[PDB]
């Protein structure tokens, strides 16, 4: 009833009670059940799409609304990559030249041929 796919299942069911889906984790733990681990009494009607409302279901956090948490996650994402990308512009130059290499950049040493000096070659 509460979820959208639970409402999508409604016109299929016939002679089935159509009870309210409630999470088996967000039941309180201190009430005595038949199975304490399932949090479920012996003959209790099982919901339309039960195994999403099981104890073995997802964790189903309750401290943030999910749309809000989507916004906070993408916010931290975007602020990190934006801060790093803007901080690429405020960079200082370095004080050394990138270092050079003998034997015309060791081109014979890293494989190489005189015609292939550009693909396997160093700074010289």
């Amino acid at each position: 009833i509460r979820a959208s796919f639970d409402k999508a299942e409604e016109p299929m069911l016939g002679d089935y009670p159509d009870i309210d889906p409630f999470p088996a984790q967000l039941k309180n733990p201190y009430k005595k059940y038949d199975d304490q681990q399932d949090r479920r009494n012996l003959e209790e009607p099982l919901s339309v799409n039960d195994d999403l409302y099981d104890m073995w279901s997802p964790d189903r956090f309750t401290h943030f609304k999910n749309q809000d948490a989507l916004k906070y996650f993408i916010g931290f994402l975007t602020i990190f990559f934006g801060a790093s990308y803007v901080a690429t512009y405020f960079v200082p130059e370095k004080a050394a030249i990138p270092r050079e290499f003998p034997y015309e950049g060791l081109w014979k040493e890293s494989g190489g041929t005189e015609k292939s000096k550009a693909f396997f070659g160093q700074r010289s």
């Binding site: 014979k108 040493e109 890293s110 494989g111 190489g112 396997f120």
Partner: peptide, 8 residues
């Protein structure tokens, strides 16, 4: 280390 030029 010189496998680049020993057996290119």
């Amino acid at each position: 280390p010189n496998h680049f030029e020993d057996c290119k």
